[PDB]
Design a binder for this molecule. Structure first.
Ligand SMILES: COc1ccc(Cl)cc1-c1nn(C)cc1NC(=O)c1cncc2cn[nH]c12
Length: 280
């Protein structure tokens, strides 16, 4: 028997966890004994794109890191089986736990995301969807990168992957090169980290979201010119403001993620040293 092969007949749905445009994550119990004693697992499936989910499954199967959600297996069409993290994402957790989470804990979460991202980077992968909604909460002390739906492999001796299909893109988290030429470098993930760091520092407050803040800067009435206006503001050197109660030294580390040219951005290794210096 293969412990990574899950039988559909024993995979019992409890409740929905969340959904995207094409994919959904559900809480299930894998109950072969039929008595509700089986382990609870997170299950990713496509709504009634199979090729992309199969590639996501193979990517996650070969990632092994404390700050990366654990692959458990598959249910053959296919479903992706992972460990279940009941606290859900930072987007859902932080607004409900401001009393539990202080700056020091926010900076440790920041270091944790950089380590998981730095490991993905070392495996020649670009995430392309690094946002707080994709960071899962293991406990009040630990976070994990929780989804790899847009992840792509960067070729050896090549510095980026060029994306053909940009239809479901989080443009308010995207670096200028991604917006202008659909070019995804590891430095593009560093740009997205800075935006995810802004979210985490504002406790994922809806009124202060990256989307809300940028629309206040560029104007909300440009329709189809919105990405063009976004690129214009970025070219002008304009950036997301300092989160309230965020010290300048943390803001300055965030500003280095957003250097217009990919080459001038601080790397994940560099950011880790930065946060650890502030924690000590
Ligand atoms: C990263 O999260 C998502 C990614 C894609 C989709 Cl389609 C939904 C969610 C989602 N939305 N929300 C609101 C919560 C989600 N997920 C969880 O709570 C969850 C818990 N334990 C383990 C895993 C693995 N993937 N997701 C997990």
């Amino acid at each position: 028997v293969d412990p990574t092969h899950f039988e559909k007949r024993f995979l019992k749905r409890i409740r929905d966890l969340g959904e995207g445009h094409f994919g959904k994550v559900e809480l299930c119990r894998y109950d072969p004994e039929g008595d509700n004693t089986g382990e609870q697992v997170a299950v990713k499936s496509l709504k009634p794109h199979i090729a992309d989910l199969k590639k996501e499954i193979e990517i996650l199967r070969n990632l092994y890191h404390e700050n990366i959600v654990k692959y458990k297996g598959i249910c053959t069409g296919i479903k992706l089986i992972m460990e279940f993290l009941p606290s859900g994402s930072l987007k859902e957790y932080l607004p409900k736990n401001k009393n539990k989470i202080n700056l020091k804990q926010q900076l440790k979460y920041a270091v944790q995301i950089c380590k998981g991202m730095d490991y993905l980077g070392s495996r020649q992968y670009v995430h392309r969807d690094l946002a707080a909604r994709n960071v899962l909460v293991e406990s009040e002390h630990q976070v994990k990168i929780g989804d790899f739906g847009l992840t792509k492999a960067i070729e050896t001796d090549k510095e980026y992957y060029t994306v053909k299909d940009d239809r479901d893109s989080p443009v308010f988290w995207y670096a200028p090169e991604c917006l202008m030429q659909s070019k995804f470098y590891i430095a593009s993930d560093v740009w997205s980290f800075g935006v995810t760091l802004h979210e985490l520092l504002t406790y994922c407050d809806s009124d202060s979201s990256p989307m809300a803040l940028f629309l206040k800067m560029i104007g909300p009435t440009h329709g189809q010119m919105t990405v063009t206006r976004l690129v214009n503001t970025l070219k002008e050197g304009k950036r997301l403001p300092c989160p309230p109660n965020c010290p300048d030294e943390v803001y300055q580390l965030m500003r280095k993620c957003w250097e217009f040219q990919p080459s001038n951005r601080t790397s994940f290794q560099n950011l880790i040293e930065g946060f650890e210096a502030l924690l000590k």
